[PDB]
Amino acid sequence: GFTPPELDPNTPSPIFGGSTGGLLRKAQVEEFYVITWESPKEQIFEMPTGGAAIMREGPNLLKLARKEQCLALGTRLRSKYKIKYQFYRVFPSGEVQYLHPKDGVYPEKVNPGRQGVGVNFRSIGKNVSPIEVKFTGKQPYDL
Amino acid sequence: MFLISWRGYWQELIETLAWAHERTPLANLIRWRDKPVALSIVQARLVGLVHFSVGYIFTYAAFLIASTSGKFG
Amino acid sequence: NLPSLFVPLVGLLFPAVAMASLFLHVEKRL
Amino acid sequence: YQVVQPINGDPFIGSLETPVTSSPLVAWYLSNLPGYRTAVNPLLRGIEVGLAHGFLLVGPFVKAGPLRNTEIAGQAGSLAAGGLVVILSICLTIYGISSFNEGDPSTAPSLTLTGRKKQPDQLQTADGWAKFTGGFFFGGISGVIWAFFLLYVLDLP
Amino acid sequence: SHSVKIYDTCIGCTQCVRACPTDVLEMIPWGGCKAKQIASAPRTEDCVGCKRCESACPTDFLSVRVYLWHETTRSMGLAY
Amino acid sequence: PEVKILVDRDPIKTSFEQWAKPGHFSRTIAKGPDTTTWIWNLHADAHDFDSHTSDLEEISRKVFSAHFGQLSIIFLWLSGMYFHGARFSNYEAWLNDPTHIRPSAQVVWPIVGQEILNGDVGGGFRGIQITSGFFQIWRASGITSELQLYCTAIGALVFAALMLFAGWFHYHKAAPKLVWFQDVESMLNHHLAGLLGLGSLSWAGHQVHVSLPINQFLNAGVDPKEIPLPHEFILNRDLLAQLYPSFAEGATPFFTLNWSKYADFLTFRGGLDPLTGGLWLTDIAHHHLAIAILFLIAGHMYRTNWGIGHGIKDILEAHKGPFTGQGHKGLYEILTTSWHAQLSINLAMLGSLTIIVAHHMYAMPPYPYLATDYGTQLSLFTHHMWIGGFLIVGAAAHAAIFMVRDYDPTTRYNDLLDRVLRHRDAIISHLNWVCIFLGFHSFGLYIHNDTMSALGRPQDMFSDTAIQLQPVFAQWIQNTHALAPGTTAPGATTSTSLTWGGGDLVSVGGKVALLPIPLGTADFLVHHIHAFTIHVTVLILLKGVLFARSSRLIPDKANLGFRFPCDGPGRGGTCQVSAWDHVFLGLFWMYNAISVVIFHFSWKMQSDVWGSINDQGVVTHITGGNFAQSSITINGWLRDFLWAQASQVIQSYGSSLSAYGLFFLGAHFVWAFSLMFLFSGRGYWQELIESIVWAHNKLKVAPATQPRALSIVQGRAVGVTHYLLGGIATTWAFFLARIIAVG
Amino acid sequence: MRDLKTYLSVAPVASTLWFAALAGLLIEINRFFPDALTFPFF
Amino acid sequence: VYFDLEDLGNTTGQWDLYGSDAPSPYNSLQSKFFETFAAPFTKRGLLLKFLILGGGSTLAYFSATASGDILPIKKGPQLPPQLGPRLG
Ligand code: CLA
Ligand code: CLA
Ligand code: CLA
Ligand code: CLA
Ligand code: CLA
Ligand code: CLA
Ligand SMILES: CC1=C(C/C=C(\C)CCC[C@H](C)CCC[C@H](C)CCCC(C)C)C(=O)c2ccccc2C1=O
Ligand SMILES: CC1=C(C/C=C(\C)CCC[C@H](C)CCC[C@H](C)CCCC(C)C)C(=O)c2ccccc2C1=O
Secondary structure (H helix, E strand, O other): OOOOOOOOOOOOOOEOOOOOOOEOHHHHHOOEEEEEEOOOOOEEEEOOOOOEEEEOOOOEEEEEOOHHHHHHHHHHHHHOOOOOEEEEEEOOOOOEEEEEOOOOOOOOOOOOOOOOOOEEOOOHHHOOOHHHHOOOOOOOOOO | OOOOOOHHHHHHHHHHHHHHHHOOOOHHHOOOOOOOOOOOHHHHHHHHHHHHHHHHHHHHHHHHHHHHHHHOO | OOHHHHHHHHHHHHHHHHHHHHHHHHOOOO | OOOOEEEOOEOOEOOEEOOOOOOHHHHHHHHOOHHHOOOOOHHHHHHHHHHHHHHHHHHHHHHHOHHHOOOOOHHHHHHHHHHHHHHHHHHHHHHHHHHOOOOOOOOOOOEOOOOOEOOOOHHHOHHHHHHHHHHHHHHHHHHHHHHHHOOOOOOOO | OOEEEEEOOOOOOOHHHHHOOOOOOEEEEOOOOOOOEEEEOOOHHHOOOOOOOHHHOOOOOOOEEEEOOOOOOOOOOOOO | OOOOOOEEOOOOOOOOOOOOOOOOOOOOHHHOOOEOHHHHHHHHOOOOHHHHOOOHHHHHHHHHHHHHHHHHHHHHHHHHHHHHHHHOOOHHHHHHOOOOOOOEEEOOOOOOOHHHHOEEEEOOEEEEEOOOOHHHHHHHHOOOOHHHHHHHHHHHHHHHHHHHHHHHHHHHOOEEOHHHHOOHHHHHHHHHHHHHHHHHHHHHHHHHHHHHHHHHHHHOOOOHHHOOOOOHHHHOHHHHHHHOHHHHOOOHHHHHOOHHHHHHOOOOOOOOOOOOOOOOHHHHHHHHHHHHHHHHHHOOOEOOOOOOOEOHHHHHHOOOOOOOOOOOOOHHHHOOOOHHHHHHHHHHHHHHHHHHHHHHHHHOOOOOOOOOOHHHHHHHHHHHHHHHHHHHHHHHHHHHHHHHHOOOOOOOOOHHHHHHHOOHHHHHHHHHHHHHHHHHHHHHHHHHHHHHHHOOOOOOOOOOOOOOOOOHHHHHHHHHHHOOEOOOEOOOOOOOOOOOOOOOOEEEOOEEEEOOOOOOHHHHHHHHHHHHHHHHHHHHHHHHHHOOOOOOOOOOHHHHOOOOOOOOOOOOOOOOOOHHHHHHHHHHHHHHHHHHHHHHHHHHHHHHHOEEEOOOOOEEEOOOOOHHHHOOOHHHHHHHHHHHHOHHHHOOOOOOOHHHHHHHHHHHHHHHHHHHHHOOOHHHHHHHHHHHHHHHHHOOOOOOOEOOOOOHHHHHHHHHHHHHHHHHHHHHHHHHHHHHHHO | OHHHHHHHOOHHHHHHHHHHHHHHHHHHHHHHOOOOOOOOOO | OOOOOOOHHHHOOOOOOOOOOOOOOOOOOHHHHHHHHOOHHHOHHHHHHHHHHHHHHHHHHHHHOOOOOOOHHHHOOOOOOOOOOOOO
């Protein structure tokens, strides 16, 4: 059993002067994302949207527009520096959805609490010909 | 252009244009109801082929008829 | 005299009505 | 000391504050254009925008059109400007039909640059945009008529 | 969203999950191969279709398959 | 802190063992080929030194020896040029009648009928007419006999040997140290004063002792064999005084500051010498003296070991304002660490300099009888334009390379670059809008004129006779230039160039050399087309540079490298997102710009300048002044330029110009050949090679090196290479045939 | 020495030497027997 | 604060940068003039029909009643017809 950390607002954000690669109307009406990490000290890190920012010492919160921007920054936070990170999704209603690391374990490490999704139990070349799924809403790989 | 230049260049260019529109006064009162994206890769091949073929047919039809009917013989 | 009525009716009025009506149908929601 | 600052103090919103964006002259001038008078009946704002644009459009059509040197009918080239106002009033009309629905509220921001709550501009409403198109058309054709009304004692008539 | 499928030819090298740039793949326990683990795609709503996972699969033929399907805001990679 | 000589001894052993191991420099390539792709990678990464290792010192020593090898090859090339001028040329015949003889320095062997290319060039010579202009240079320098060209070729061969030996020496023996390369102040000091200053001074010394007197004797009509040898002007100064009297003093006015005496051979008269058509040689020698003094002074700005002088670090750090933050602080550490940054800067500047050379050499002919050799002038202009354009595209490429590989804000930060990155979106969007506006308001005018001329409405066009768009600014500027001598330039006797000053038409040997160039609506439209094409090229290249690291579509693009095909069909499609593909497209657009530039040059010169002058002063140009009315139309460019002037190249068969007729079509062929690569992708070709491999394996004749279709990046590289080669060679054949026939 | 001979056996150098010898041979053949649209010796 | 899960309009910058929100500078009488004379034009559906039909009929009038002094297409050819390469 794992319990995802709730998103704490008023968490410090890295020092940055501002760039044009930030949020747009998509964040206002569609969705946006927020990545959080701890960090040991004040450092400089390249932003996935623009230039460089000063990572504050202690808890850090950074809001981005896409999920891929969060995982890319997190991967660099885990490689160059040695920092654990989580990120969530935020709908315009105020609701927050925990994303990664889902189990609290990184997805590249096997974890016993995980269920199979979209796992076909045959060789890839054992799919059927498209005629056998014609006039149906099926695909030869959905099965 | 559609056959030599490919998509990813034009997608990043359209992103820089979407930012421009959202940050321009007066015009930002007008909102697009379909998100601007670059033409699909297959769509680009089709559009480039159609321009190629239309130019092919029209260029030769113009030369054919003008060089023949200009003399009529 | 008839071209002076139908040429604008198909090159100006018809594409105007056609493009506007197709715009409304394409952008319509349910 | 630096001149460029993040947009309203937030660095992670995709914009910046510069003398072109955030300056007292620019902020006041844009806040006093009829499109940014978020508390005025959109019919009147349309009248002003229509009057200004209909008046401006007459110049290029008359001085650059085909009948420009045939002074017998070149002054009537304002009809082309009036026709464009008609076309633009269609573009304006068909825009609101697709953008806003009858019962839909306003899509404009309901906030202020300082955080306080605000009443959204009724221009992003179906009936508000309808009044703006009607105002732009009325001011538009009036701008074209008033521009063509003047013709003499000007260095480029 | 794009469809992603994992076939039982997977050997459990966890390479598709490392290359994925939007955290779509997972490693679940399994009994078929030696590493006791197989891949699964529980979050294809975030899948962009880069096929960076297929570029990293050592199985012949592939064990990850990305079938590009209905485009969404998430699958098109839009920040706007 | 103390600038000094620093080298290492025997860092790399001289042996053929690594010759026999292909791909030794790379760790993945050294294992040999498993598939054919290996063979291509070995050539693609042959000069990527900073990817073979990460040690800056090894990289710098490799770069030093590569420079020495390039200098060796250039000296070998010059040796070949001077040797062909001495052994297989008619330079002595061109020296007696420069206005009728065609310069030629290549004679072909008679094997398969190619001796037809040995055309009648005059002076009893059958050969290939040359447009490089070496005859004009050798005449300006004072060379007369074939023996002097022989000796120059031998000296160039010796210098090529010296450069090759030095390249071996400073890599295998005494190989310099990193700090030695990084002594930027000392290096700039020696390049400003030692290289450029002393070089200009040496050339001014030659010009005042050999060029001026021998050229006076050549202008007077003295037979070149009856002309005294150059060194005879260094022994008996009576010979120098009989031509230039001030040489009778003996460096006394120079030391006493009576320099007003030297105005006999150091003048500021400007314009052209009406006998040769080139700039006054006295003015050129005076110029080189002034350039020598200026550079000898400028080579003292940067401190080294004696306290006095500047440190570039301080000058950079001191330049920061309220808009750019702490700008320029950090640039000294960047430009002393990254080779690619220096390469980008220097490629940009050298290419723009080559373009400036192309303009200045046509508007101010420096060599005698150059202005009337229309083939040589056109070829020089076009060649320098292409060199500059390519070099600027390379500047863009290496800027992007630096961005991907040498940029790191956590180690070598700079505020200016970070601020640029923080609004790349605004920059690119504004450049995009400017490009759209220029495309409409230049080419759209051409479409307007075409549609008005086709509809029988020549008064509704944009023309000098209808809606006029006069370039008032450029006209006023050239007028201000015309009136400058005697007013805002009292020392100047005539105009800076002949294209400025009204009147003063210089002609040589029945052909015109230069005259005031008209500027009308056509010039306006073409200049705006040039601005638009330059802007679109800049947009492509700069957008590739700024978005090399990250974008909203791919936030980790820097990890994918500088040169990668795509990042998958997802996100809608990510083809050609790498900065390399941006250089790939900027190549096409640089071609599209430079081609219009050189076509403008060709038509303008053949319409409003070049031509034949009467005895009474009636000048008829090569084309009958058709530039004002015909070039304001796309159909005019198609008909009155291409269709009309391609006649010479499509009629050259059976003459000495038939090689140009062959190259015309061959370049058409390779240009269309590129379209197979540019329009297709490697998957189809691999699937075809699969069946071909089946056919081979059926007959026990399939190679171990498994055939593989070209990579995506290689597909684009081959495509753009063949496209550029075909287009440029087509224009080359067309230009050369046209200008050698009608010249 | 053995390494130098191994370099001379690489594909481009072997191709140049082979094609140079081939080019020279065909040149001398068309030098002693120029033109010739047919096989005249029957 | 700048990140507040309560109000996301302030969090995501959904502000009115150049909105004045001030009362009307247009005085009365003038506004009532335009609000009564531009009143029937503010029904977007009716305006759409009025623009299309009115503009189309206006275009049809000025095109059907064109003049040869204004359009060369109505003036027709004034010169005798030419002779083809072989035919009429
Ligand atoms: C597919 C057959 C066809 C084609 C290619 C054309 C083409 C043309 N016609 Mg023509 N026309 C047609 C059939 C056709 N017509 C028929 C069947 C009639 C009735 C006998 C007419 C009566 C007519 C008149 C009176 C005039 C033209 C004119 C013209 C020319 C100007 C364009 C125009 O005014 O649009 C065509 C206008 C129409 C009223 C024709 C449309 C009505 C018929 C029944 C077609 C049905 C249209 C339908 C709503 C949509 C069709 C679907 C799709 C196939 C387009 C143009 C070259 C004008 C001219 O001479 O130019 C100088 C003009 O004065 N046409
Ligand atoms: C295919 C149909 C079509 C038709 C019938 C016309 C017809 C015309 N064009 Mg046009 N054009 C077309 C296609 C067409 N065009 C396309 C596809 C393009 C893009 C390449 C252009 C680009 C173009 C340009 C750039 C210009 C024209 C101009 C003209 C006018 C020149 C003749 C004149 O002097 O009349 C009379 C001249 C007048 C100024 C009187 C105007 C006529 C009244 C005002 C029309 C009223 C409009 C009406 C209220 C609403 C119309 C829209 C409605 C159906 C929704 C003429 C009426 C010229 C022009 O308009 O002059 C300024 C000109 O400048 N055209
Ligand atoms: C002028 C342009 C051009 C040319 C020359 C070719 C030529 C060719 N195409 Mg291609 N194609 C083109 C344009 C062109 N294409 C375009 C625009 C497209 C659309 C994308 C295609 C799409 C296409 C497809 C899909 C296919 C081809 C195929 C082929 C090959 C057919 C086999 C053949 O005919 O024998 C040879 C014909 C030649 C013209 C070869 C000429 C070159 C000779 C060998 C020069 C000799 C070398 C000589 C020593 C020079 C020295 C060079 C030095 C620097 C080393 C052939 C080499 C088919 C194929 O692969 O065949 C199996 C194939 O399936 N083409
Ligand atoms: C007055 C001193 C001097 C002179 C004349 C030169 C001249 C030159 N340098 Mg150099 N340099 C100098 C000092 C000097 N340097 C100093 C103090 C430093 C820092 C320690 C550097 C560091 C440096 C680097 C890193 C590079 C050069 C390069 C070059 C060549 C540039 C290419 C060119 O312009 O082609 C023009 C060709 C000529 C002008 C022909 C004349 C060449 C003569 C024979 C060389 C004599 C100058 C030499 C320094 C004297 C010592 C040699 C002696 C021991 C035998 C050029 C020949 C580039 C290079 O290596 O090119 C191969 C390059 O990469 N220089
Ligand atoms: C002083 C100028 C200069 C220098 C030192 C470099 C140096 C470098 N460049 Mg660069 N570049 C330059 C100018 C320069 N470039 C210019 C002017 C352009 C614009 C075209 C470019 C565009 C460019 C690109 C796009 C790339 C580089 C790359 C590189 C690196 C690898 C080079 C290599 O091994 O390729 C190997 C060389 C070859 C495989 C030869 C290719 C054959 C050519 C292209 C066609 C030959 C045609 C010939 C001229 C005439 C036809 C003859 C034929 C019929 C026989 C290297 C450090 C590459 C890199 O990886 O960056 C790190 C990279 O991809 N450059
Ligand atoms: C003849 C072929 C062609 C044409 C017309 C264009 C045109 C254009 N290119 Mg392109 N390109 C081409 C080939 C071509 N390219 C090829 C082969 C390549 C591969 C190397 C590229 C690669 C390339 C790149 C990488 C880029 C462009 C860009 C652009 C745009 C520059 C902005 C501009 O000039 O606005 C003006 C528009 C024009 C000049 C087109 C003609 C417009 C006419 C005159 C107006 C007619 C309007 C008329 C009323 C239409 C209404 C009719 C209606 C009835 C339908 C422009 C539209 C740049 C861009 O995106 O813009 C910033 C850019 O980034 N091109
Ligand atoms: C220019 C370009 C774009 C950008 C092009 C775009 C975004 C299309 C813009 C079209 C505008 C709306 C004008 C089109 C005008 C048409 C003539 C209208 C036809 C509509 C109906 C008649 C069907 C790509 O997206 C692309 C993708 C892949 C390879 C090459 C390219 C490419 O070259
Ligand atoms: C034709 C084509 C190919 C096929 C092109 C190939 C395979 C080039 C290689 C052909 C040469 C001739 C093979 C090399 C042969 C060796 C030199 C050995 C020859 C022996 C002697 C004659 C020297 C691609 O790989 C490709 C990839 C991406 C986009 C477009 C294309 C594309 O259009």
